[PDB]
Amino acid sequence: MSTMFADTLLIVFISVCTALLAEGITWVLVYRTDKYKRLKAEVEKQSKKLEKKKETITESAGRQQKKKIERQEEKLKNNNRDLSMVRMKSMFAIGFCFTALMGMFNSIFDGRVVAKLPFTPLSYIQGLSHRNLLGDDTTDCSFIFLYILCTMSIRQNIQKILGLAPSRAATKQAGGF
Amino acid sequence: VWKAFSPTTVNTGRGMEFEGAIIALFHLLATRTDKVRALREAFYRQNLPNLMNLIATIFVFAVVIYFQGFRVDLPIKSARYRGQYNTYPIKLFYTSNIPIILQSALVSNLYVISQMLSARFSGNLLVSLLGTWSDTSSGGPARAYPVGGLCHYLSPPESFGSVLEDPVHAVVYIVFMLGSCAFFSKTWIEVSGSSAKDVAKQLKEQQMVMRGHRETSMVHELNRYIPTAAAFGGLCIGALSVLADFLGAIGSGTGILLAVTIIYQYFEIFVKEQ
Amino acid sequence: AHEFTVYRMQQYDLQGQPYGTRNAVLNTEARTIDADVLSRRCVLMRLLDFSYEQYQKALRQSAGAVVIILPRAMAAVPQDVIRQFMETEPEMLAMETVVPVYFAVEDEALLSIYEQTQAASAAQGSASAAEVLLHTATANGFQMVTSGVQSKAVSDWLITSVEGRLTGLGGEDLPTIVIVAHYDAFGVAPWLSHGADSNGSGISVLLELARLFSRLYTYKRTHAAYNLLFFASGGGKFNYQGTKRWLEDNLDHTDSSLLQDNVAFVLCLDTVGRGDSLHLHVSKPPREGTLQHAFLRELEAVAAHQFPEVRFSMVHKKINLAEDILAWEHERFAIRRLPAFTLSHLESHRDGQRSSIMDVRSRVDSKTLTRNTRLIAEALTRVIYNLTEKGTPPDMPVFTEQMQIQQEQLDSVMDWLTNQPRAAQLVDKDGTLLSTLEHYLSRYLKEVKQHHIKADKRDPEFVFYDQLKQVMNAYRVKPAIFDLLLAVCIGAYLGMAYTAVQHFDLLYKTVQRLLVKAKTQ
Amino acid sequence: MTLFHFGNCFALAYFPYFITYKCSGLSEYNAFWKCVQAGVTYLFVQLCKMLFLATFFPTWEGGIYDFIGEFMKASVDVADLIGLNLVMSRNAGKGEYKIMVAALGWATAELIMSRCIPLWVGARGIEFDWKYIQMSIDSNISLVHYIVASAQVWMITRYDLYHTFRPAVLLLMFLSVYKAFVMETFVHLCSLGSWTALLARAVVTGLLALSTLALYVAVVNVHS
């Protein structure tokens, strides 16, 4: 096992560890909190009641039912904003952990080619794929780029396996915020 | 604010010194083993804005606000509506900053004319009487001071030391400032249409009537107070300006008075509109 | 932190070819050669432990920088190590390297840092992973940072040569003999290029000859019928640029009639301060009956008869125009068709001693320099006065008693030359070295003049770079694993504090019970 | 690495204050604004103290350790006690609530003014120094010391405090005021290492805290 592939595997392992740490932090600061559980349940219940009322509401529903829909959309949006702010606190904590993680990566993988890209990166991403690497081979993969790909793949899969992924209803409403 | 917090460094012959009094104080306290001596130097710096000067400015600001709050409330009732009590406030500074503004503009024009006349017609007796200017680069950015003539008498003395050196100049300046402020306040009330008659006319237009008093009576009562309020307020304003200048408040005594009164009027406008 | 002075390996371009180190800025952790991974690390090597193979290994591994620690006494350093370094030094300069190379004189703090880095590098292999983690966490790292900016080319550097003349009895039309020595020193580090032997010895000989000839020419009875020109050339080590410019100015311009038709010969002195071997390097063998041949014969006769210890021989080298750098100064004259030869104790111009920072005053022997100066002076005087045809025997020295060479003066001149580095990139036009040299020549010679050569802007023959000297700062640092452990300890401390505050009521009740018991008792 | 050291120092300095604020129930009382007011009072008192020192005391030029100067600084430290008393009188509530609000606001204001800027500039530097961690511990020691001082000031200011307890309270207040001067003199005299000095400060603060707590419990029980 050459040092290059060993570094690749170490980066994958670190990305797994950091995804698990980020999920643990999110669980400690958000998922376990009664405010979060309550807001999530409220968002899901209001979304389901809004959908069911939209389905049951024919054009003949009348200005009063439309205004009741609008009032429910407003309540749902407010609850979703509060939920987003609670998640944002975790996002900030994870941001701070990411700053620390970047320091660790610099200490371990500085100047080292960690993987070979089977393709030439586009010039706009080359600044990331070849960042802080010595060489002209644009197929050289930077630890930053490999870590980003690993984190993007692993984090969502882990959330889904653990059932900690935001509910699709919550994501649909978060699209507004 | 710039003089208080400026991060620019000016090279005094001994060392590079921060212009901002607070920043210089913090830098000196951090960098100097003699923390007490550094603090004293920051308080009594000859060449840069001092912490003591900032404290003097804050004290003046509080005093000015306290005087600004002085008012005489005249009870006015709606004739149409029973039981509606409102007060017409006659402020101590009835004429506002305008007497200061007019005096400063007149003095500014006099200085400009005097400097032009001195530059173009050197040695004429009228030019010397109006003002003689000398550029004193005494260890500082060049400042042209009027050393003789009316402009000299009109100029504020820089310190209590200068007042002690030239007592006649300080007395003449104080008398001129107080007299000009009182005169401008009296003239301004008549020119502005803010005389007791005009205020009574405004009250009549607003259907506000003083209890037990006809509108003519209102005019007489207002005429009793408004001229006195104007002249006394102008005298007080001049005295406060002179005192702040002697105290060396940052931004000038006139400047601090103008800022405080303008802010107060703007706040009153904001509250009234709101 | 510890701040110490570092001397950067020189950067220059000659004839469009890049030489030396291109980078001058360092911000990397210090490591010894023992470390497995040197990439973007400052590699510390002692001169005693320095090896060319290790230096190449660091370059291959893309070391962040190389710092070479020099012992304070060069004489103290073992001779074999100095010889090996001198042999490696031309290859190092010839090889262009991106990695910055610096030289630092040893200091006790620097040695302690080096030892600590060596121990930290070694410890990683010897222990189990848990022990290695603990050792790394407790170990102190050092971060090396250079205060200097990146180096830049000097567009307008001027090289200055000094010339002086003594007229013979008969005027300028008389045959002119030119004695040339380059004053510039060269080495891996310009600030350390004292160049005591190369060519401080040659300059000392030239100045002593100038004094002796001036004294002879002062008096009509001893006044010769020759013109003597003494030329101290700048940029000798950079392909004799000063000599080339001086030759162009004298020969292209019709007014400078002295060189066009009157040059008897040119004697160049290079590295005459050491050794018992003396070699006369000639581009073309002197023809019989020429003044250059007469000088060669006189020099051989004087060496054989008066100084049998000195082994004199003639070395013939044909000029190769293809080579970018001329081997010897006389080659430039031969290119201009002037008869010229170089006298040196070195068998070859390629000897590392000729271009080394290790050429220091202690290397030069005052007795050897005095002997070589006497031999040169006797041979020149014998040629100038035609003593052999006049029947003066070879064994008899002219330079005795009043005309004796002054050893103390030669030593003082050598000390003055070696007190400061004389690298061409450090010798400014207004420098003390040039002003003193001009004053000294002016004392004994007439019409002393300074000739200034500047590289062409369109096609610069030489380019010099700044940032030859910098301050390097070693900052103590702790590894990220140490920071992680400290963070864990802080988290445990916060947990203990939280539990203590939560359970404070138990403490309050216990104190209340104790106070009640104390009241009851 | 520099960020890791700065983050560790900042967390160690800041989190204990937050833990104390939450656990003591001040958050339940919405005391945050009262703590801010206490910090403003601290800033005012510190400014007054600096002005007093500059106006009344010239700097001694003697190279030797300025024993008189340190004694004068400790004497001026009484202003901090006066400010704490003013804050507690301004703040309404139970004695424990007043003590905790005053101590927390005063300690937080001192920490912000005196250590955050040094932590920010120094701990982000390339060089690792233990001093930043020591200062972070010292902030916690200061917080405990201020809690003790506030409790002592409340006890002395109690109208119902028995005359027998009053001398003990006054002595404890005297020791608290002069603690910094005594510690600096002791460290100078013994040439103590920074870790030993920090440990000694912690021990002295702990002993003062225990004595103050015992006296407080005795005073409360005597009225219970």
Other beta carbons within 10 angstroms of residue D25's beta carbon come to 12
How far apart CA B209 and CA B78 sit, in angstroms, is 6
Q: What are phi and psi of C154, to 5 degrees?
A: -95, 110
> D3, A99 in Cβ contact below 8 A?
yes
Q: What is the 3-state secondary structure (H, E, C) of C27-63?
A: EEEEEECCCCCCECEEEEEECCCCCHHHHHHHHHCCE
As to burial, measured by CB atoms within 10 angstroms (0-12 exposed, 13-18 middle, 19+ buried), residue C268 is buried
Residue in C143, C475, C497 closest to D19 by CB: C497
Residues 6+ apart with CB under 8 A from C83: C352
* B-D contacts (CB, under 8 Å): 19
Helices (H), A27-175: 34-56, 63-109, 123-129, 143-162, 168-174
C62 and A112 within 8 Å at the Cβ level: the answer is no
Among all residues of chain B, which has the CA nearest to that of D60? B34
Query: Which chain A residues touch C40 with a CB distance below 8 Å?
Result: 110-111
* A-D contacts (CB, under 8 Å): 9
D126 and C511 within 8 Å at the Cβ level: the answer is no
Alpha carbon B264 to chain centroid, angstroms: 14
| Interchain contact C480–D (C-beta under 8 A) | yes
Q: Please name which of C259, C24, C36 lies closest in space to residue C145, comparing C-alpha atoms.
A: C24
As to burial, measured by CB atoms within 10 angstroms (0-12 exposed, 13-18 middle, 19+ buried), residue D121 is exposed
> C26, C65 in Cβ contact below 8 A?
yes
Q: How far is C490 from chain D (nearest CA, A)?
A: 6
Query: Which chain D residues touch B43 with a CB distance below 8 Å?
Result: 51, 54-55
> C415, C361 in Cβ contact below 8 A?
yes
As to burial, measured by CB atoms within 10 angstroms (0-12 exposed, 13-18 middle, 19+ buried), residue B200 is buried
Q: Which two tokens stand for residue C332?
A: 């430039």
Q: How far apart are the first and last CA of chain C?
A: 61
Chains touching chain A through at least 3 C-beta pairs below 8 angstroms are C, D
Q: What are phi and psi of D47, to 5 degrees?
A: -60, -45
Q: How far apart are the first and last CA of chain B?
A: 29
D4 and A103 within 8 Å at the Cβ level: the answer is yes
> C118, C2 in Cβ contact below 8 A?
no
Mutation site, C515, C516, C519, C520, interface D, largest D CB count within 10 A: C515
> What range defines the domain where residue B172 resides?
1-272
Among all residues of chain B, which has the CA nearest to that of D114? B30
B34 and D59 within 8 Å at the Cβ level: the answer is yes
Query: Which chain A residues touch D3 with a CB distance below 8 Å?
Result: 99-100, 103
Extended beta strands in C195-271, E state: 227-233, 263-269
Mutation site, D3, D6, D12, D100, interface C, largest C CB count within 10 A: D12
- The answer to whether the peptide bond before residue A79 is cis (omega within 30 degrees of 0) is no
Residues of D with CB under 8 A from a CB of B: 50-51, 53-55, 57-59, 69
Is residue C221 helix, strand or coil?
helix
Other beta carbons within 10 angstroms of residue C299's beta carbon come to 24
C477 and D7 within 8 Å at the Cβ level: the answer is no
- The neighbouring-strand residues paired with A95 are none
The dihedral over CA atoms of B84, B90, B91, B95, expressed in degrees to the nearest 10, equals 130
Query: Could you tell me the CA-to-CA distances from C462 to C237, C323, C455, D13 in Å, in that order?
Result: 11, 16, 6, 59
A107 and C39 within 8 Å at the Cβ level: the answer is no
Among all residues of chain D, which has the CA nearest to that of C505? D24
Q: How far is C503 from chain D (nearest CA, A)?
A: 10
Residue in D128, D133, D213 closest to C477 by CB: D128
- The neighbouring-strand residues paired with B113 are none
How far apart CA B243 and CA B185 sit, in angstroms, is 20
Q: Please name which of B141, B154, B172 lies closest in space to residue B113, comparing C-alpha atoms.
A: B154
Query: Could you tell me the CA-to-CA distances from B16 to B2, B12, C301 in Å, in that order?
Result: 18, 6, 73
Q: What is the 3-state secondary structure (H, E, C) of C258-316?
A: HHHHCEEEEEEECCCCCCCEEEEEECCCCCCCCHHHHHHHHHHHHHHHHCCCCEEEEEE
| Interchain contact D126–A (C-beta under 8 A) | no
How far apart CA C448 and CA C69 sit, in angstroms, is 42
Query: Could you tell me the CA-to-CA distances from C392 to C209, C382, C387, C397, C402 in Å, in that order?
Result: 21, 9, 5, 10, 19
Q: How far is B264 from chain D (nearest CA, A)?
A: 25
Look at strands C340-344 and C263-269 and give their pairing. parallel
Residues of C with CB under 8 A from a CB of A: 39-40, 62, 479-480, 484
> C329, C342 in Cβ contact below 8 A?
yes
- The neighbouring-strand residues paired with C13 are C18, C463
How far apart CA D118 and CA D112 sit, in angstroms, is 10
> C302, C390 in Cβ contact below 8 A?
no
> C79, C274 in Cβ contact below 8 A?
no
Extended beta strands in C106-226, E state: 141-146, 153-154, 158-166, 176-182
Question: What is the sign of the dihedral through the CA atoms of B16, B18, B23 and B24?
Answer: positive
Among all residues of chain C, which has the CA nearest to that of D211? C511
| Interchain contact C490–D (C-beta under 8 A) | yes
Q: At what angle do helices C407-419 and C202-218 cross, to 10 degrees?
A: 130
Counting the structural domains of chain B, the total is 1
Mutation site, D52, D59, D68, D76, interface B, largest B CB count within 10 A: D59
As to burial, measured by CB atoms within 10 angstroms (0-12 exposed, 13-18 middle, 19+ buried), residue A89 is middle
B39 and D53 within 8 Å at the Cβ level: the answer is yes
| Interchain contact C17–D (C-beta under 8 A) | no
D1 and C477 within 8 Å at the Cβ level: the answer is yes
Mutation site, B22, B35, B36, B52, interface D, largest D CB count within 10 A: B36
Is residue B160 helix, strand or coil?
helix
Other beta carbons within 10 angstroms of residue D95's beta carbon come to 17
How far apart CA A87 and CA B234 sit, in angstroms, is 61
Buried b (16+ CB within 10 A) or exposed e, C198-225: bbbbbbbbbbbbbbbbbebbeeeeeebe
Alpha carbon C226 to chain centroid, angstroms: 36
Question: What is the sign of the dihedral through the CA atoms of C3, C5, C9 and C12?
Answer: positive
- Counting every residue, how long is chain D? 224
Q: Is there an interface between A and D (3+ Cβ pairs < 8 A)? A: yes
Query: Which chain B residues touch D58 with a CB distance below 8 Å?
Result: 36-37
Q: How far is A92 from chain D (nearest CA, A)?
A: 14
How far apart CA C226 and CA C258 sit, in angstroms, is 12
A107 and C479 within 8 Å at the Cβ level: the answer is yes
D54 and B34 within 8 Å at the Cβ level: the answer is no
A112 and C479 within 8 Å at the Cβ level: the answer is no
Return the CATH number at B149. Answer: 1.10.3370.10
